[PDB]
Structure 1
Amino acid sequence: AMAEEQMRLPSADVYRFAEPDSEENIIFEEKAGIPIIKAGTVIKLIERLTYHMYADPNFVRTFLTTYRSFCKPQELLSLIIERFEIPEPEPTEADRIAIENGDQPLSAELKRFRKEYIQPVQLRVLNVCRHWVEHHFYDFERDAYLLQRMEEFIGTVRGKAMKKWVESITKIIQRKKIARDTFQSSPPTVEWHISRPGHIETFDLLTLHPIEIARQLTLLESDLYRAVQPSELVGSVWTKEDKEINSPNLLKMIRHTTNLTLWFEKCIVETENLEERVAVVSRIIEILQVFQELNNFNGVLEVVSAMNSSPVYRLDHTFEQIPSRQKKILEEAHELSEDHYKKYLAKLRSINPPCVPFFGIYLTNILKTEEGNPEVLKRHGKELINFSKRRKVAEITGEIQQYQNQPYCLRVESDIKRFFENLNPMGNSMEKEFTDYLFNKSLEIEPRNPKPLPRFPKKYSYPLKSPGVRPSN
């Protein structure tokens, strides 16, 4: 009987998106509301992306976030244009006869197929096009040819029934192209210490104010967190060949984290004088204290990584001189990470904006999803794209997005921003050469047990006492 349903759809030789659903081309999870697609052929994914029966804004969103893991942007545009071009059924025998007598056909089925299948599918295709240009315009910025195809397609759609949708998409494309270029309170005063405004040559860990290091690193990290698009995290594209094109905001975030962490370690192990090194560790702990004040969890866990690093953690003689109060701040910061970040998560959900979440936990959990789930599922010999796997990755990038609209009430300082944008602790060395050298400096400044502890001369010729972390008026 339902076979009567599929004989009212075009044949497989004139149209590819009306073959019946089977266990070997589409799978769902297990209500009587919209089903959850688990796997399918890219043809079945396109069919359901643009399904006639209902709107599906969650599949549209998830599909357009994750599709580059199984389908090129050029191929996606080709498939949805093909989906759009639906052949009309032949006239019935009686209407055939009438047509060649120059008489009006009834066209009952033809009119129904247009209203109930073609029009809605076509509206679903324009809806996909709009979401695509609104939420993923970078696809069109990276590929001027893709944008040319989209505009010709949209510009040749017929009917006043779809005029509205077309004008809307064209508006969004024009707003996006045009883009080519604050506050409710006052921010607090920019804090200075030994370095004075403009005197950039004197900028260093101990010469800048620790309050203002933490503030400027929080602003720079806020912006880097906010620039990351979910698609930069799908199908591990930041760990593969085209990384710089596909994941540029993510790589900037990872490279800042690497550079700040390694710079902290470098500042520590390259201060060979024990008394001066204690001052460096203690200043980095105060920077952490201000990160916490600002709910910059990213920065907090960057300081934790530095102190937990194989070169730093072994410095028994240094941590021996750190006052109890500073050790406790560092211990409680570490404990954020224990038991799969239980206390970090409780803390994140308990605070009020603004914040910078710890980014590393999302990368860890996307990687475990990528490595622990198969790219494709097999049914009856056929390979189906594992969509549930992409959905799981997209839900984690969903968590990232929750926190990307939280600007800080803090003045920028351009020279300090520049100073931290320009961190290059590794020099022209690669990462393993640098970490090996840091460990070997550690051994030199604090040798392993049997050998006793040499003295080393002072390198800093300015006062090492900290101005503290009260902003004071």
Structure 2
Amino acid sequence: QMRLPSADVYRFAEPDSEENIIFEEGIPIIKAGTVIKLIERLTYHMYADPNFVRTFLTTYRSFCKPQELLSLIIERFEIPEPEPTEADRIAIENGDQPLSAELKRFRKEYIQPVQLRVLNVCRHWVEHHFYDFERDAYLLQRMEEFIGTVRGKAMKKWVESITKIIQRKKIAHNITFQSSPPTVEWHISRPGHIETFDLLTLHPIEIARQLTLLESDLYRAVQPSELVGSVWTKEDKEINSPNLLKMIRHTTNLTLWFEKCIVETENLEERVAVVSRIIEILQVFQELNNFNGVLEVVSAMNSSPVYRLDHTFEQIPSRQKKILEEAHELSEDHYKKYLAKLRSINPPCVPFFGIYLTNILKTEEGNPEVLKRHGKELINFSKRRKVAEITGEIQQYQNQPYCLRVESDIKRFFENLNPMGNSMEKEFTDYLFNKSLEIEPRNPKPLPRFPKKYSYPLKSPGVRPSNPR
């Protein structure tokens, strides 16, 4: 309505008023509105806005329960057809059957779109936010009921692919590439010798590659289930947010293996080879747009135990004092320079996740859940849009996969990495820090001498890749 049948029975023929929808500033964008009016627009008969669907199914849970959504869209799907009209009523009563010129106008302009646009909501809701269903069987049951007992011939094609998606989903990535991936590079440690593997004996190029594969794999697993509603900060962080947590813990670990590799290499020459080999990795991380890895390395250099090692960084080559400082400048001034580089590289990349976390969390905890206009309480939707904006920016980088050959052994080495061992965060932090005080003690105490620990050559293979037959 739009047109024709009595508006009484159908809940969504409510007319649009200042008391139930609010707009903003070539579709229209919704600032706020009642729950009904929001679903009416989610399946409006005039235009399909497919971004609005994703914004809704990403975020709707904060203002409406899954069971009550289903009920609500079912209700919308069931649309009162116009009573056989006045030239219909006179054609039925003199023999033959009517022509129905404004029953079919209504059925083609209103009922056809709204029903199809609703099936598109279920197709998304199932194929994309299936968690709502694996945490409620009755919901799945009702939804499956609903779909079966739809009976059009128009909707016959689309009922069919939804019944089959719900099946595929109730159980369980073939990737095609253009070009081949470069050959895996080896240094001191030879293939299959997993025990000799360490920061100095693995090829710096191939460290950065395998840790970019691993860190991409981790970034990609984050669903927006684990993000919306600041769930990664509440007491059930571990239940609701396990993949997000899994990759923050990874990043946090590697930053610690780097800190530990530096301050435990007691000898000065040997430590300067290690600090340098890390900056040579940071440099390959950047070639691969692995920001998460760059910000590990910059974050490790910045840490208390490693920052203070002035005698060690005085000896870094001049080219790498440049590389390190420039990567540090990314984080400077509210990650100004980094958000720059990100919104301008040509992916695949691996963003630094922490910024997205903070923006989601401030936006939730800084915008009203409702809007009191005329003593009515409209759902504040521009807030839900802003959150979905982010979770979309995040989904956006999860698309393109890296063209790098995974090395089984090197990857199992970094997964099974644990610099902390059995000690706690305070215990280990302090230890690292005292090894810093030991290997390069405060002034004026004189810089002592320690012995070499590495039996292998400390020269780097260089971070220029080497391509044979």
Deviation at 1:362, TM superposition (A): 2.5
- Alpha-carbon deviation of 1:116? 5.4
Does structure 2 conserve the Cα–Cα contact (< 8 Å) formed by 1:66 and 1:231? no
Q: Tell me the distance in 1 between the aligned counterparts of 2:180 and 2:48.
A: 45
Instruction: Point out the more displaced range, 384-393 or 327-336.
Output: 384-393
Is the aligned partner of 1:99 residue 2:95? no
Query: Where does residue 148 of structure 1 map in the other structure?
Result: 141
Q: Deviations over 1:126-161 (max 9, x none)?
A: 121112223333444454443333222111112223
Structure 1 residues 374-453: aligned runs within 5 Å? 374-453=368-447
Q: Judge conservation of contact 2:5–2:83 (CA < 8 Å) in 1.
A: no
1:366: how far off?
2.7
Aligned-pair distance for 1:236? 1.9
1:186 to 180, 184, 191: 180
**Which of 199, 202, 205 does residue 199 from structure 2 map onto?**
205
Quote the offset at 1:468 in angstroms.
Answer: 2.5
| Equivalent-residue separation in structure 1 for 2:236 and 2:12 (angstroms) | 31
Distance 2:121 2:224 in 1: 18
- Per-residue CA deviations over 1:218-259 (Å, capped at 9, x if unaligned) read 111222223333443322222234444544432222222111
- CA deviation vs aligned residue, 1:378-412 (integer Å, no higher than 9, x gap): 22233333221221222223323333333333211
How many Å separate the matches in 2 of 1:397 and 1:91? 48
Task: Please give the secondary structure, in 2, of the residue aligned with 1:378.
Answer: strand
SS of equivalent to 2:89 = helix
Distance 1:434 1:78 in 2: 54
Q: State the Cα distance separating 1:276 from its structure 2 match.
A: 2.7
Counterpart CA distance in 2 for 1:423 and 1:408 is: 23
TM-superposed deviation, 1:62: 1.4
Q: Per-residue deviation at 1:36?
A: 0.7
How far the C-alpha of 1:15 sits from its partner, in A, is 5.3
1:36 and 1:29 map into 2 onto residues whose CA distance is 6
Any unmatched runs of 5+ in structure 1? 1-5
SS of structure 2 residue aligned to 1:22: coil
Q: 1:24 to 1:338 in 2, by over 3 A?
A: same
Secondary structure (helix, strand or coil) at the match of 1:354 reads coil
What's the TM-score once normalised by structure 1's chain length? Answer: 0.85
Change (3 A) 1:309 1:13: farther
Alignment of 1:222-237 (within 5 A): 222-237=216-231
Q: Deviations over 1:38-85 (max 9, x none)?
A: 122333222221223432222112112222343343332232223324
Structure-1 separation of matches of 2:34 and 2:414: 47
With over 3 angstroms needed to count, the CA separation of the structure-2 counterparts of 1:398 and 1:448, relative to structure 1, is same
1:25 Cα offset (Å)? 3.1
Distance 1:196 1:7 in 2: 73
The corresponding residue for 2:242 is 248
C-alpha spacing 1:42/1:347, structure 2 compared with 1 (3 Å):
same
Which deviates more from structure 2 when the two are superposed, residues 428-437 or residues 195-204?
428-437
The 3 A distance-change label for structure 1 pair 230 and 463 is same
Further displaced range: 327-336 or 184-193: 184-193
1:218–1:291 contact (8 Å) kept in structure 2: yes
In structure 2, the CA distance between the partners of 1:433 and 1:368, relative to structure 1 (3 Å rule), is: farther
Aligned positions, number = 466
Distance (Å, rounded) in 2 between the aligned partners of 1:100 and 1:315: 99
Please report how far the alpha carbon of residue 327 of structure 1 lies from its aligned counterpart in structure 2 after TM superposition. 1.1
Q: Secondary structure at the match of 2:181?
A: coil
Equivalent residues of 1:9, 1:18 under 8 A apart: no
State how far apart, in whole Å, the 2-side matches of 1:217 and 1:276 are.
24
In 1, Cα distance between the equivalents of 2:12 and 2:433? 60
Please, which moves more after superposition, 190-199 or 15-24?
15-24
Task: Check 1:396–1:7 CA distance in 2 against 1; reply closer, same or farther (3 A cut).
Answer: closer
| Structure 1 residue 192, shift from structure 2 partner | 2.2
d(CA) in 1 for partners of 2:127 and 2:103?
34
Corresponding position of 1:46 = 39
Computed over aligned residues only, the root mean square deviation of the Cα atoms, in angstroms, reads 3.6
CA contact (8 A) 2:370 2:377 kept: yes
Whether the 8 Å contact between 1:11 and 1:18 is mirrored in structure 2 is no
Q: Is the 8 A contact 1:219 1:412 kept in 2?
A: yes
CA–CA distance in structure 2, aligned partners of residues 100 and 443 of structure 1: 102
- More moved, 421-430 vs 105-114: 105-114
Match of 1:3 in 2: none
Q: For each residue in 1:75-117, what CA deviation from the matched residue of structure 2 results, as whole angstroms up to 9, or x when unmatched?
A: 3223222332445688999999999999999999887766655
Distance 1:379 1:455, change over 3 A: farther
Residue identity over aligned pairs, in percent, reads: 100
How big is each residue's C-alpha offset from its partner over 1:315-346, in whole Å with a ceiling of 9 and x where there is no partner?
Answer: 22221222222111100111222234343344
2:102 is the alignment partner of 1:109: yes
Q: Is the 8 A contact 2:21 2:30 kept in 1?
A: yes
Query: Matched residues in 1 for 2:79 and 2:51: separation?
Result: 25
1:151-209 CA-partner distances (Å, limit 9, x unpaired): 22111112223222211222333444564994333333322223221121222222222
Distance 1:397 1:180 in 2: 22
Residue 210 to residue 36, structure 1, CA distance change in 2 (3 Å): same
> Compared with structure 1, are the counterparts of its residues 314 and 136 closer, same or farther at alpha carbon in structure 2 (3 Å cutoff)?
same
Q: CA deviation at 1:444?
A: 3.7
Mapped pair 1:68 → 2:64: no
Give the C-alpha shift of residue 260 in structure 1.
1.4
CA drift of 1:432 comes to 4.8
